[PDB]
Symmetry: C4
Subunit: 389 residues, 4 copies
Amino acid sequence: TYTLVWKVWILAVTLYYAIRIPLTLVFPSLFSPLLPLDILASLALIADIPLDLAFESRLPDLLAALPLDLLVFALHLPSPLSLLSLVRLLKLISVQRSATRILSYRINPALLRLLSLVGFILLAAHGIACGWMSLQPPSENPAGTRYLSAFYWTITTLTTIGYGDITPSTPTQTVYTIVIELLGAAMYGLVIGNIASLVSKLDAAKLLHRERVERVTAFLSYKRISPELQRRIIEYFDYLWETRRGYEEREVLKELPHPLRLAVAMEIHGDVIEKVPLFKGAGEEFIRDIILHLEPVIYGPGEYIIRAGEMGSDVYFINRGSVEVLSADEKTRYAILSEGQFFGEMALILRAPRTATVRARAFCDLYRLDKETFDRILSRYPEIAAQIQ
Amino acid sequence: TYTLVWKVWILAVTLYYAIRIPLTLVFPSLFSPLLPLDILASLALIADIPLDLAFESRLPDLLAALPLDLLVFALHLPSPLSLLSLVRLLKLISVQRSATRILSYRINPALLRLLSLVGFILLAAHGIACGWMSLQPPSENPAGTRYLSAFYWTITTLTTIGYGDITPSTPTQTVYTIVIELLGAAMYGLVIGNIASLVSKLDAAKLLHRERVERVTAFLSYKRISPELQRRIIEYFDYLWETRRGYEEREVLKELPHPLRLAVAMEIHGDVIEKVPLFKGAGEEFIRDIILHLEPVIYGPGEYIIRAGEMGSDVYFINRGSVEVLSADEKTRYAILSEGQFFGEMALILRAPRTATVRARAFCDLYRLDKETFDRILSRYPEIAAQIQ
Amino acid sequence: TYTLVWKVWILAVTLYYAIRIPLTLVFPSLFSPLLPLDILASLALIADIPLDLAFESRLPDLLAALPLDLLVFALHLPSPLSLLSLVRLLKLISVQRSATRILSYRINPALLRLLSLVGFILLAAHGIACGWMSLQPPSENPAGTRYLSAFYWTITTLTTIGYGDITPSTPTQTVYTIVIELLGAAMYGLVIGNIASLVSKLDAAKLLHRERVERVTAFLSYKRISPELQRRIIEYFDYLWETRRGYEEREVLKELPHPLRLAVAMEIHGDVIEKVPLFKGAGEEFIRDIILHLEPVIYGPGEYIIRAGEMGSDVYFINRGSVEVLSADEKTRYAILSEGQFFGEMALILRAPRTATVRARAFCDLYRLDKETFDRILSRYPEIAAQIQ
Amino acid sequence: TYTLVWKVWILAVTLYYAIRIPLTLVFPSLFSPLLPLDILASLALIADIPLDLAFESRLPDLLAALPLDLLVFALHLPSPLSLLSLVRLLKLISVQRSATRILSYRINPALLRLLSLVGFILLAAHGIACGWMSLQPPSENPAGTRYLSAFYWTITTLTTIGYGDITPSTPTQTVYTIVIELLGAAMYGLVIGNIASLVSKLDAAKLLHRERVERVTAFLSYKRISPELQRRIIEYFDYLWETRRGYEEREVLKELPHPLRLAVAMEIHGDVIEKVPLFKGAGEEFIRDIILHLEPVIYGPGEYIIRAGEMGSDVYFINRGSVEVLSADEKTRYAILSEGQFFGEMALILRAPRTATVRARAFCDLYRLDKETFDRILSRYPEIAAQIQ
Ligand SMILES: Nc1ncnc2c1ncn2[C@@H]1O[C@@H]2COP(=O)(O)O[C@H]2[C@H]1O
Ligand SMILES: Nc1ncnc2c1ncn2[C@@H]1O[C@@H]2COP(=O)(O)O[C@H]2[C@H]1O
Ligand SMILES: Nc1ncnc2c1ncn2[C@@H]1O[C@@H]2COP(=O)(O)O[C@H]2[C@H]1O
Ligand SMILES: Nc1ncnc2c1ncn2[C@@H]1O[C@@H]2COP(=O)(O)O[C@H]2[C@H]1O
């Protein structure tokens, strides 16, 4: 758990190198003031190059391990022989790999890639400003002012803005500006593509539900469906989006493995069947088997779950909604059933027409178990089929 | 239902603050002329900060509740001590959250996010123009003209255009222009990504049908399918796209819950089975059970639904098309069947070869019920199996 | 079929209006030279406004029907009272709707939307150049040269390039340039989004096959699969992509309706079962029923379809590949089977171990029919079960 | 295998032509110095135009075959009559087609299209620089310097940067700059769209797993699932992503054909059933049949695979994890089972309650075979049902 601070320190030291080595390349009078920090960074990299193998393609790390920057700056080598100090930025590839490895589970990978690209773009802009120094004619200008001008020019170039108040004056400056132009176009396209990918998946669930509703309502309007049924279906879809975020229970449950799905079924509806008087005198295997076959169904307000006098082969367990039960002819209210309650128990023990109708008060979700699955389950458990009969 | 006008008023007051507080920061001679509106806005925010809890992360609302802007403007504090008045824009986050909460169901969420980003970009452009005032050297220029120049510069920057006729002249102006450059690149990328996400889902159904047709025709061309069958399949796909928008009936129906699917089946084909002479003397449960197993099939023009003399185990209910019936050898036209009619009733009561052939005149859609599902349904209802036999 | 030329003429006349009315607004000395074309266009629009109801939201058409442009130009009304002539561009909305309606089936809808946006952008650029005339100070410059300058400026603005050699000089010019800046950013974002949507679906099948291969090979590498089996699976996937474009036969077939799927099965494998000696003395219903249950399987080179001495319950019909049959111990080659041939016929008439092994020479695709479906089919046709026994 | 070097040579020769013919159009004093290379390229194209038919829409190849460039340059034809030499770039279309044909399987097609577009954009930029020469006024400037200026201008235009330090001065230059402006906007939009398409599919598997986890956890949080079960499910999903990259075994296996799936089952679990004492004295057909019905299930740490005293109808084969077995009441550890081992063998030979419980130590993956599939398999093989009983 203590490797996170070490990785953060590696981030800090590699950013310090990325900001320092091109500035020191530009200004030779910068090696000595930051010499202690430079040697500290070098020894940190040396001590980190074996530490990567502990608690874990490695060519960039090896290239950025040995200190080329110290030799070229101490010897005051010319620019072609000092451009080899730029190998310290090979640490950035391994840093980005480690960052994607450590915090991918906590941060959206598209957003993480976008922030990594933004940081790399800022570092590249600093490097391009330093390169702009390398070709700008010498002048009696403060280092801060000329760095501000170079950073302004490179930020104008990368963002494809092109004010034109800072333009090349020498052929080498023109070649460098063409290269930076192409690089800035490439990274601006990368930024826009990353933003587009992030945005297109920002509301994936909402868009999925929207197209789900649109296709259903278009199909219904083709089939000449009355506005009442259309409004009821739209209200059901709105309730589904507001409660389950438009996710069907069956699709989510089947995507889980057998033991996790069994535990989920336990926690969702084990109490509601534990209240059930019929299923006592039975082992936990029978309970798990019957609740693994509970098919959820959502009933809107004013909908008839069943009709009295009809055959009936289903048993319903209320999960989160509230539902009312009326008489056979639906004049008087027998009782009120809420979460944790169940009805239709008479259908399991006897094959006779139902006694009373039950209608949903509001949007209620309940689990329906047909007689086929119940008979299949009790067939595997003859000892349970005795007392129920 | 009266909270919509209150939310609209909150929108208006927060936009007024967003347009006012930076302008008043720029021009000190603006606090007094808009003092009544300022105090009205302040009292509206104070009265709204408890109203959010009624009829419903809250840190921005609390930050934007108390009036920092009134204190700094009355005391004429310097710019570093008056930048704290910008906390009133924390109301914008809650405003955007409320806007996404209230009208997401009525407006495409991608388009809603795009418009919200456009409005925020306009407000940010106004703020950036005000900041451009804050660093522009003082001059004897009208407020309108200098605001027009600043807004022109910031709109040029944000849209990544960069005319260059308005460029920084001071180092602080250069730093501010770099910051605004990065911000404008970021928001232009955001705009382009939002537009790309909106466009990619503009014709999701049409693109789905297009790739559906393309894969089918490529597979058929691989299998050496004659141009006649290819043209017939293409015509069927065109009819499907023009009627059902390329949506299969089974996929749409199975995506609905059991009661809503039952009601949809009711409205689609309850009349066509109510005409059916065979199914009278039966309860509504049997009707719902049989029509819940009706598998829709689309028959193109000139296609043979069945052949006379063949065994036959299907019954078809015309839904929206028109179909013709010929003789066994197909010389004479027996009759014409249209929407609401049905044929194949003889197969349900007797297992004998069919008497006559039936061929589709135009593109007709009808529901086919095989003998297996019918026998399964009537087995559950022995009382219905009596009169049918 | 003669409405296509009329729609093309409407396209030409509305483009002529879009290019003419702003130019004539800019140059008052342009109404008379194009007066015959103007009145011809007006009468064409008048005669077309009832023709839309024949052989087929209509508010833009009604607005663009009556000739506001003729009145304002003849009366030489000022700019605020002549801006009402721009209602003729309301014809563009109906033109775009008709274009999307007529040729959506022949041209990729994303590409069609991109071209429509490009044309609208060109027309808008012409209009913006005309507006640039409307605010440019009067000068002794040729109309062609000033139009070229205005079009250059507007094309620079819309493409977010911003050279800056043409910049506003008056406050009204600055406001117009800000508006055109925002519009150009919006339409450039629209162009980029349309291009991104078009590109993301350019290789949908290829990308689907690529991710299909990648997930399979990653899962196999996780399960420690030898390089031989990995190479065989990669070769099979390459063959599948090169022949069927990565589309599984079952997925394509099940996406078709029952009669079209039956006809496809007819054309694919009716000859190969017509050669089959066992299935003669049988009606076409039995043939269609058995071939509707043919499950396709792809066998790579060197793969064992079955093994001699094993029980065996499958019959295979070669479709497009070439396959060889060896002895029971696989020393001698019994024969060579090609497209249109079949083997495994002994398993249908007798439940005994197979006599010889059969191995694929090259990548061969054949249809496998297990004994379960065959027994189910022949059970429905007892008259066919006689001679086969 | 020797056609790859020929295709590379064609690439080199067509790039040489693309860089040469516009430069020679600009500078008439360039035909003679590169005459041997020109005639070598011409003869290479002539010898390649029949070679395309060997070891394989052809109109561009025929157009670019015959040497129009040699005639116009030798005759020193004017620009309108020498623009016909640009037909040599028709070779680029066939080159791109061949490149997409040869290395699509080895390189991501989106990335390949992006690189092809980048190369075409560089060639077009060179051509646009040459066209900029064609309209630039003659001056005593070195060819290198003026080419650098033209390339700088065209790169500024295409990347939508627009510095403005190089602007048109003549009407023809203005028209050319407008055309290049539109072309640069189009290709920049193409680059951004290609980058967006590449990025959106960079982490398709990771994004799929992320949305899989998000929908599951949202559904569970809706159903009031305790943080313990939520954490267990999150840990299982993390393990699944880290091992199988979030791919379910069933989905991957069913996407393979029957023989390849059979071979995969062989290699995955043939040894673990070869250790099994019960299944000896059985043929390979029975082994393949039983292992083709092995349903994989993933059990997290601390999870109960079965419970002692319960009926039990499953047999589990450990594949990659490690699992422990305890007593019936779970006080003592019976043994330790690892990869290649199996338990639950008693359920196959006798229908009695299980003797001991088995719980997973760490995340273990094992294949569960229920009694239904085993009974179905052994029913087809009566000779195997003897010794097992
Ligand atoms: N007053 C009530 N309280 C609780 N449950 C009831 C009441 N009336 C009817 N039910 C249930 O509703 C069912 C409808 O008919 P059943 O025969 O299935 O058995 C009935 C009971 O399970
Ligand atoms: N003239 C007709 N009018 C209506 N239906 C018919 C006519 N002729 C045949 N049919 C139907 O077409 C069916 C074809 O053969 P069946 O034996 O299934 O029973 C037949 C009737 O259901
Ligand atoms: N020489 C051959 N020519 C054609 N088919 C053959 C030949 N030898 C074997 N077969 C087929 O291969 C099958 C393998 O064993 P069966 O008993 O299924 O019946 C066999 C025949 O159908
Ligand atoms: N000590 C052990 N070593 C290996 N396997 C065991 C051990 N104890 C129990 N099992 C297995 O675990 C199973 C649990 O109950 P069964 O009756 O299915 O048969 C048991 C054996 O297959």
